Amino acid sequence: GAPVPVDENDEGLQRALQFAMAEYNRASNDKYSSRVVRVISAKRQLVSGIKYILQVEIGRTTCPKSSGDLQSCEFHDEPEMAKYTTCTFVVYSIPWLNQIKLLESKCQ
């Protein structure tokens, strides 16, 4: 009948995590200009199995994804409130009937 919050006590979600790291690998194409920052929240829904709708805040920068070479790093100057992009992940996961996927990343 409705959505609910996700508990970080289940270690089975550590798999759906490797999914977001991939969709992101093809979303940043190059190796610079794009970079994630932090998570905004996460709620799980049900549709046969479970689903994880997250709201991430990704921005641009002079680094290759998370880590990389050189140091400095930054979203081009000090745009603590500029140059950014919100997005939401919709993961799918269900070991009870053979299922698990990654719908997509709703980013604008």
Side-chain angles (χ1 to χ4, degrees):
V4 280
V6 201
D7 42 43
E8 190 105 30
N9 292 260
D10 183 25
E11 148 67 2
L13 176 66
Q14 203 232 221
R15 174 194 257 259
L17 153 281
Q18 271 256 202
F19 223 137
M21 246 74 247
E23 18 160 326
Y24 195 49
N25 75 242
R26 203 191 281 160
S28 30
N29 171 3
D30 65 9
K31 187 118 219 168
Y32 273 110
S33 79
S34 314
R35 74 152 283 185
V36 86
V37 196
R38 285 128 166 196
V39 99
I40 300 179
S41 202
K43 323 163 71 166
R44 51 152 170 201
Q45 204 151 276
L46 56 146
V47 270
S48 205
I50 347 191
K51 176 140 103 240
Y52 307 72
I53 46 169
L54 117 85
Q55 305 136 258
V56 315
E57 175 169 315
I58 56 269
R60 309 210 94 76
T61 175
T62 53
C63 327
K65 331 198 138 164
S66 272
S67 81
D69 25 270
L70 299 148
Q71 318 293 117
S72 20
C73 256
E74 259 239 68
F75 307 75
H76 170 203
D77 203 7
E78 68 247 356
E80 259 137 355
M81 52 237 272
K83 234 119 253 178
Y84 289 129
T85 346
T86 196
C87 183
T88 292
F89 304 176
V90 193
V91 195
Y92 219 128
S93 184
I94 346 170
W96 92 145
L97 291 176
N98 190 354
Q99 218 59 80
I100 235 301
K101 231 118 192 237
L102 192 296
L103 210 64
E104 31 152 80
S105 212
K106 243 205 161 167
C107 337
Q108 167 170 329

